[PDB]
Structure formats: C-alpha cells, structure tokens
Design a binder for this molecule. Structure first.
Ligand SMILES: NC(=O)c1ccc[n+]([C@@H]2O[C@H](COP(=O)([O-])OP(=O)(O)OC[C@H]3O[C@@H](n4cnc5c(N)ncnc54)[C@H](OP(=O)(O)O)[C@@H]3O)[C@@H](O)[C@H]2O)c1
Ligand SMILES: Nc1nc(N)c2nc(CN(CO)c3ccc(C(=O)N[C@@H](CCC(=O)O)C(=O)O)cc3)cnc2n1
Length: 186
C-alpha cells in the first residue's frame, strides 16, 4: 500500500458536519475534487481505500454507496454486521490499517484515505509517521455540530503547491473556497 492521507472540507469556524450532513449547500466542484483525489491511484492495477466512521458512511446518499472506484471500509464498534454496500468493517483504526498490510490487499490497494469523521481524523492525525492532510478551506462560517481540530503548524507544513491541485480561490454558489495540502513527517 501507499501513503496515508486525510481529506476534509472545513468551514471558517472549523465545522465539518451538521445534522448528519454537510453544513453548507452542495458544492458540485468540491465534491468532484473529493471524488478525483480519493479515486485516483498513482499505481496501475490498484485502487485506493477509503476509511470512514459509521455516521460518515450514512452521510453519503445511498445512491452513491459504496463510493465507486474505491474500496470502502467502515469503522464501527457496535454494528453486528457490515453496513449493506461496505466492502470491509473494522472495529478500530489499527485493525483497518493492518487489513491494508495483508498481502492480497496490499497488492490491490494504493493510497489509504481517511474521510472522517471527527474521531477518525483525530486518531489518524496523531499517528506518527508520514501523513498528508488534503484540506478544503470553505471561507465562510456555517452552523455545525461536528468539527475538525485546528492544525498544528509546528507538525504540519502547508505545501506551496501539489500536483493536480488547483491553488486559485474557487467559488460556487457565492461561497469561496481553496484547496490546501499539509504534510507531516514525525
Ligand atoms: N466536511 C467533511 O469533510 C466531512 C467529512 C466527514 C464527515 N462529515 C460530516 O461529519 C458528520 C459525521 O462525522 P462524525 O464525527 O459525526 O461521525 P463518524 O466518525 O463518521 O462516525 C462515528 C461513529 O463511527 C464509529 N467509529 C468512529 N471512530 C471509530 C474507531 N476509531 N473505531 C471504531 N469505530 C469508530 C462509531 O460507530 P459505532 O457507534 O457503531 O461504534 C462512532 O459512533 C456528518 O455530519 C458528515 O456529513 C464531513
Ligand atoms: N474535501 C472534502 N469534501 C467533502 N464534502 C467531504 N465529505 C466527506 C464526507 N461526506 C459528507 O460529510 C461525503 C458525502 C458524500 C460524498 C459523495 O457522495 N461522494 C461521491 C459523489 C461525487 C459527485 O458528486 O460527483 C463520490 O465521491 O463519488 C462524499 C463525501 C469526507 N471528506 C470530504 N472531503
């Protein structure tokens, strides 16, 4: 398997969710960015794996589950069975990552993408080693009930550019946003 990555879109007040959905109106090109970044594998013959908590799984409309072109893994401590459509169910993040080191999965999985929610991001971001954060800065406050922790810049470096990421400010529906990539190596 390849690198470990988080991807997230965050409002100005660090919100990521509200009532089991996103806090802002649908941003078509921001979803297309999430889709492109999580689907595109750098190695031929492999797919990427997305890891998410249970509420994040059910925040994806059923018609889009599992996320196409990606191996979908759901984290849950209490589910008796994998949610219909999921490819894998793991009881902890460590269990999920050790799944990716199985030989027959490692030769089919390139990047691992953490796609939320709050507790999954937090655990991944404190795991030592190489990690990238793909962060969309939604440049407006939105009412939220689920949040992302402020990034420690002594640990995470904001990259000046990244292949395949547009650096210019974007705007949809009167909402400005910009794509950022952070990297730590501790
Ligand atoms: N803006 C963004 O980029 C973004 C990204 C993701 C999500 N969201 C939004 O955020 C909200 C969902 O996130 P959330 O933080 O509320 O919930 P979440 O982390 O997706 O789901 C929490 C549940 O997942 C399971 N879980 C989480 N961490 C686990 C671990 N380490 N091991 C085993 N199981 C684990 C537990 O399920 P059990 O109770 O079954 O044990 C837990 O109750 C929604 O509003 C969604 O739309 C936004
Ligand atoms: N930067 C960024 N932005 C976010 N919004 C985000 N959201 C999440 C979690 N949630 C909602 O909380 C999603 C809900 C739905 C989809 C979804 O349906 N995806 C399809 C459709 C693509 C299309 O519309 O064509 C696909 O990826 O194929 C994806 C994530 C995680 N990480 C994100 N990171």
């Amino acid at each position: 398997v390849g690198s470990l990555n988080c991807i997230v879109a965050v409002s100005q007040n660090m919100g990521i969710g509200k009532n089991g959905d996103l806090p802002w109106p649908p941003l078509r090109n921001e979803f297309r960015y999430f889709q492109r970044m999580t689907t595109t594998s750098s190695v031929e013959g492999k797919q990427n794996l997305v890891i998410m908590g249970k509420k994040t799984w059910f925040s994806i409309p059923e018609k889009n589950r599992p996320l196409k072109g990606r191996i979908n893994l759901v984290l849950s401590r209490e589910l008796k069975e994998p949610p219909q459509g999921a490819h894998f169910l793991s009881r902890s993040l460590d269990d999920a990552l050790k799944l990716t080191e199985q030989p027959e999965l490692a030769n089919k999985v390139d990047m691992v993408w953490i796609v939320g929610g709050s507790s999954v991001y937090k655990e991944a971001m404190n795991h030592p080693g190489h990690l990238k954060l793909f962060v969309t800065r939604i440049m407006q406050d939105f009412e939220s009930d689920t949040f992302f922790p402020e990034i420690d810049l002594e640990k995470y470096k904001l990259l000046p550019e990244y292949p395949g990421v547009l650096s210019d400010v974007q705007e949809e529906k009167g909402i400005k946003y910009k794509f950022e990539v952070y990297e730590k190596n501790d």
